[PDB]
Each structure stands twice: as structure tokens, then as C-alpha cells.
Amino acid sequence: DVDRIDKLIAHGEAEYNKWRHPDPYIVPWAPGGSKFCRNPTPPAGIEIVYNYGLED
Amino acid sequence: LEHFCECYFNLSGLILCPVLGSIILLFIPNSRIRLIRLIGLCASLITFLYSLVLWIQFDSSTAKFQFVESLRWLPYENINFYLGIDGISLFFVILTTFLIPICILVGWSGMRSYGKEYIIAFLICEFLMIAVFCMLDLLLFYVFFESVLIPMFIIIGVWGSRQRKIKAAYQFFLYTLLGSLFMLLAILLILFQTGTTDLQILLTTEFSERRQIFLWIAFFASFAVKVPMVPVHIWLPEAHVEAPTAG
DSSP states (O other), rough: OHHHHHHHHHHHHHHHHHHOSSSSOOHHHHHHHTTTTOOOOOOOOOOOSSSOOOOO | OOOOOOOSSOOOHHHHHHHHHHHHHSSSOOTTTTHHHHHHHHHHHHHHHHHHHHHHHHHHSOOOOOOEEEEEEOOOOSEEEEEEETTTHHHHHHHHHHHHHHHHHHTTTHHHHHHHHHHHHHHHHHHHHHHHHTTTTTTHHHHHHHHHHHHHHHHHHHOOTEEEEEEHHHHHHHHHHHHHHHHHHHHHHHHHHSSOBHHHHHTTSSSOOOHHHHHHHHHHHHHHHTOOOOOSSSSSHHHHSSSSSOO
């Protein structure tokens, strides 16, 4: 029954959301990990201008 | 009573320096950018050095106004005016003279499009501001402060970045003018009692409690718009943001 599936899903999702571990494990370089965004590779497309602000 | 000071370095020359710079620049062709820039920068630097010398000859034991010198207004000599500094105003003069050359240096790269009008405005601001810091009279304080509004108005409106500079300059001029007019009312109130507006004299005249309260409220209204104090502080954000960097 397709409408039973929707209610079984919705009941299930709220169950996971209620008894979810309050401090889940995350791989260090994954988002939210302890190594995330640490010494990341510089983005490409960056230009450094020399001789700016000359009087002439 | 002529009060001319014996010191070689006095307030008059420090006042004249940026005036001379401005008068020299009005006649130099805008085609001569290198000369205009160097004249303005050198004049401001000489003024800063003069202010440092004024610091050197300062007496830190006296409570009497130092380097006091007088300037006559009428041959009747009824209204005579004085210039002098003390421990309270000396450092503000030195700060003014230090900040003006910085302002000339900030717009060094864009001085091709600014012109003599930019350097002249800042030099006139410097001269008026030093004058304001050096006055021993309520009336001249009012004139020279009220005069600083014109070059600041020009500086905000012409070299500001966006079209919000219109509203910003309007609010600046109008708020400051209201405050200055209130000060003027207080200066005339004092004059009616004393017959003079000389600081050294009014420091020795007793004011009644009721008149002290009323004169304080008129002086308050003027100074509190410039502090700024709540709720007359709202002109400052638009004015300070919309102005050019040196402004």
C-alpha cells in the first residue's frame, strides 16, 4: 500500500531524529570533522598585482 | 593692550603657513600636477615641524595661557582678540598638523583627477582647524568653527564615492549649523552680561545659578551635536561613511 509506505517512512524518520546519537563520529577530513578546512589547497584563478598605486 | 609674544616661533606663522600654500596653488596651472602635489605636501610638512617646535618651547609649570598674542580688529580697540594655547590644546594642534599631510598623501595616486582643489580644501581646513584650537575668545571660536563647514561640505560632496554623498553632506551641514547657532545664542547671552567675550575675563566673572543653567543648556546643545551624543548622533554615520578617505 503506497499510502502506508508514506506513514511508515514518516514514523521512521522521526524515530531516527529522536534517538540519533548526540555526538556522532565523523571522519576527520569530512565536513564537520576535526581536520576539515585545515591547510586546504589554495584556490585556482588568483592573481597578485605588482606596482599598484604608482603616482604616474 | 598689545600682547605680542617674544618667542620666535609663534601661533601666527603656524596659522599663515597653509594660507600661503593655498594662495600659491590658486595660480598654478592644473597641467602642473607634480608641482601642485609637492607644494602641498611640503607646506603641510613644514606646518607639522613648526607645531613640533611649538611643543618644544612649552612650559609645563604654568597655568597661564602660553605664547599669548593679540590681533586688533578696530582702531577703537574696544574689541581685541587673543591667541593662546595651554596643556589642554597643544596636543590637538600637533595632531591636526600631523593628520593633514597624511590626508594629502592618501590621495597621491588620484591627484591627477583631484587637482589643486583637493589640496587647497585640505589646507584651508587645516588653517581653520588650528585657528579654532588656538582661540581665547568665544566669538572667534564660533566664526572659525562655523567656517570649517564650507570646505568639509565641498570635500564630502565632490570626492565622495556614491550618490548618497548628497544626503550625507546635507545632513552634516544642517546638524552642525543648528548646533553652531545655539552656541551663537549663548555667546550673545554672555556678551549682554559681560560686555566682552574674552575667555581670560569670563573665567573671572561670576554667573548666577539660573543663568549658569541656561547658558550651560545652550553650550550643551552646540557641543553635543559635535560629540556626538544620543539622539543627535545619526548624522555621523552617513557623513563619515560617504566622505572620501581623507575626508
